[PDB]
């Protein structure tokens, strides 16, 4: 029961969500470079950088985003960056496992301890049990970005109006893709709550890295306010 307009919305969001890449050059490094804390962090830097470029490209195309106040635009972009990144990592993680073990080993050895890294992978497994389709990851990503709850937003109602149609769409998709589990939508929203705990967790990661003398490149410094 998607409306015509909902189906158009959905196609548009899908087109933008897969206008993506894991560039090949970063895959090549993952699967081929030398292995040390130093190289692994450089690879991780590149990965984070790609996620943020992807996020920017996705964000700017979201229907209505260009109509928003320009400072709110930045507040939404910075406010969503951590959540959106870990959601995209969860999607990827849950899609070969040799490739996966090698990447996971790099992430676990990129200059901070396992108490910082394990919680990411528990989250990937947690959301993985949900068996979400690509459309669900895309709409959730849009809903994360268009959150009216972020810090510093001047016109929260304008953002709420852009988020509401996506939530309606996601609710209908949950019934299309998982018709036998009527709590699926509620479970997705429970995982969003889980995702939000990464904001604090990410900040502790950055802090540990920086005590360890790691530096962040320009885009990461700006997006995460280092």
């Amino acid at each position: 029961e998607l409306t015509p307009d909902q189906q158009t919305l959905l196609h548009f969001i899908m087109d933008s969500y897969n206008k993506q890449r894991m560039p090949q050059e970063i895959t090549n490094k993952i699967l081929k470079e030398a292995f040390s804390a130093e190289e692994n962090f450089l690879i991780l830097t590149e990965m984070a950088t790609n996620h943020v470029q992807v996020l920017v490209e996705f964000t700017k195309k979201l229907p209505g985003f260009q109509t928003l106040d320009h400072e709110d635009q930045i507040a939404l972009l910075k406010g969503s960056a951590v959540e959106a990144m870990f959601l995209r990592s969860a999607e990827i993680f849950n899609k070969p496992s040799g490739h996966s073990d090698l990447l996971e080993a790099r992430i676990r050895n990129s200059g901070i301890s396992d108490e910082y890294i394990t919680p990411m992978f528990s989250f990937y497994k947690s959301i993985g049990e949900l068996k979400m389709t690509q459309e669900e990851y895309a709409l959730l990503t849009a809903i994360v970005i268009l959150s009216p709850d972020r810090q510093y937003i001047k016109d929260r109602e304008a953002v709420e109006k852009l988020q509401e149609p996506l939530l309606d769409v996601l609710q209908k998709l949950c019934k299309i893709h998982q018709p036998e589990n009527p709590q699926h939508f509620a479970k997705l929203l429970g995982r969003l709550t889980e995702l939000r705990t990464f904001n604090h967790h990410h900040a502790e990661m950055l802090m540990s890295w920086r005590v360890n003398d790691h530096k962040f490149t320009p885009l990461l410094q700006e997006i995460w306010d280092v």
Binding site: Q53, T59, I74, K78, E222, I223
Partner: peptide
């Protein structure tokens, strides 16, 4: 936020 504004505006 020059860098972010630059990327959002291109």
């Amino acid at each position: 936020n020059a860098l972010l504004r630059y990327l959002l505006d291109k």
